Design a protein around this motif. Structure first.
Motif, PDB file in Angstrom:
ATOM      1  N   UNK A  93       0.864  -1.209   0.000  1.00 53.69           N
ATOM      2  CA  UNK A  93       0.000   0.000   0.000  1.00 53.69           C
ATOM      3  C   UNK A  93       0.891   1.247   0.000  1.00 53.69           C
ATOM      4  N   UNK A  94       1.946   1.226   0.832  1.00 57.74           N
ATOM      5  CA  UNK A  94       2.890   2.346   0.866  1.00 57.74           C
ATOM      6  C   UNK A  94       3.371   2.732  -0.519  1.00 57.74           C
TER       7      UNK A  94
ATOM      8  N   UNK B 177      -9.915   6.067  -9.761  1.00 56.44           N
ATOM      9  CA  UNK B 177     -10.527   4.741  -9.558  1.00 56.44           C
ATOM     10  C   UNK B 177      -9.409   3.751  -9.601  1.00 56.44           C
ATOM     11  N   UNK B 178      -9.602   2.602  -8.920  1.00 55.17           N
ATOM     12  CA  UNK B 178      -8.499   1.681  -8.811  1.00 55.17           C
ATOM     13  C   UNK B 178      -9.049   0.293  -9.119  1.00 55.17           C
TER      14      UNK B 178
ATOM     15  N   UNK C  75      -4.737  -4.964  -1.563  1.00 57.04           N
ATOM     16  CA  UNK C  75      -4.000  -3.686  -1.488  1.00 57.04           C
ATOM     17  C   UNK C  75      -4.952  -2.508  -1.726  1.00 57.04           C
ATOM     18  N   UNK C  76      -5.889  -2.637  -2.666  1.00 56.44           N
ATOM     19  CA  UNK C  76      -6.809  -1.478  -2.956  1.00 56.44           C
ATOM     20  C   UNK C  76      -7.756  -1.252  -1.778  1.00 56.44           C
TER      21      UNK C  76
ATOM     22  N   UNK D 160     -12.557  -1.420  -8.237  1.00 58.78           N
ATOM     23  CA  UNK D 160     -13.105  -2.575  -8.995  1.00 58.78           C
ATOM     24  C   UNK D 160     -12.193  -3.722  -8.592  1.00 58.78           C
ATOM     25  N   UNK D 161     -12.760  -4.820  -8.093  1.00 53.52           N
ATOM     26  CA  UNK D 161     -11.949  -5.870  -7.411  1.00 53.52           C
ATOM     27  C   UNK D 161     -12.152  -7.149  -8.203  1.00 53.52           C
TER      28      UNK D 161
END
Length: 263
Positions: free
Chosen positions: A71-72, A87-88, A97-98, A113-114
């Motif tokens: 995440x960092x 958006x991710x 992570x998102x 969106x996963x």
């Protein structure tokens, strides 16, 4: 870091989208869906530090003990690029992570969106993750004893559908990972449990569900829809697999275009 993680910004638009790849791939996994997004969005691509396409001497086994450190990196990238809102789209470990990044920085993540997504792979008491401890133990052993045989057998099972070009492609990048780093990533993933924090996500979320995923039981997408803290929907693809961006990219692009329309 922009250089180390191979960051690329392509397309243009006020709507910025980050594509974050999963285990056993790099950003090239998005190449078939990419042409459906660049007319309409500015697209940020990068490789996780564990990817085979990143020099493996960057991998700090200590730091990357925890998904927080990934995440960092993602946050350091977006901040470096001066992007305030995006958006991710995250596959696999990048779905985890998102989730975490959208909690740390809710200002930055306008929509998730996963794909291939789970908050926890291990089974627990009335939680069906799809894996048992002893089963994973044997997989981690196989990764160490003979990585290449392990990867050969895993690639078609992950792709799921009989799509030889997609098996060849995922194999190419799985064989590219350094085997010690591949085991360490899986061990890290299998120690993660995001169930308790799902309610802290504020962003709207689309969970992409395929008809079978070796790593994600059918019941996980409803569990995410019931527990993620933002407005969530489950969008169904009419095919199987853990890597639909490789195996059914045109179909997945229909879901991506609709999910990325407004946020």
């Amino acid at each position: 870091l922009l250089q180390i993680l191979n960051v690329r910004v392509v397309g243009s638009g006020e709507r910025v989208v980050v594509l974050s790849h999963g285990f056993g791939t790099d950003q090239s996994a998005w190449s078939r869906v990419l042409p459906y997004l660049t007319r309409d969005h500015r697209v940020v691509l990068y490789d996780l530090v564990c990817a085979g396409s990143v020099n493996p001497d960057h991998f700090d086994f200590r730091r990357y003990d925890n998904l927080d450190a990934y995440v960092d990196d993602l946050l350091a990238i977006l901040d470096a690029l001066r992007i305030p809102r995006c958006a991710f789209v995250g596959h696999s470990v990048s779905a985890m992570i998102g989730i975490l990044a959208s909690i740390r920085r809710p200002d930055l993540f306008a929509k998730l969106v996963l794909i291939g997504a789970s908050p926890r792979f291990l089974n627990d008491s009335d939680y069906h993750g799809g894996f048992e401890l002893e089963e994973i133990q044997q997989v981690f052993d196989a990764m160490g004893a003979n990585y290449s045989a392990w990867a050969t057998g895993y690639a078609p099972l992950a792709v799921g559908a009989d799509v030889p070009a997609a098996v060849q492609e995922f194999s190419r990048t799985l064989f590219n990972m350094r085997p010690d780093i591949s085991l360490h990533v899986c061990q890290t993933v299998f120690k993660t449990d995001l169930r308790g924090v799902l309610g802290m996500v504020r962003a709207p979320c689309v969970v992409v569900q395929t008809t079978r995923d070796v790593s994600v039981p059918a019941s996980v997408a409803a569990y995410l829809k019931a527990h993620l803290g933002g407005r969530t929907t489950v969008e169904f693809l009419q095919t199987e697999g853990h890597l639909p961006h490789l195996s059914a990219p045109s179909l997945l692009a229909q879901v991506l275009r609709r999910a990325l329309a407004r946020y």
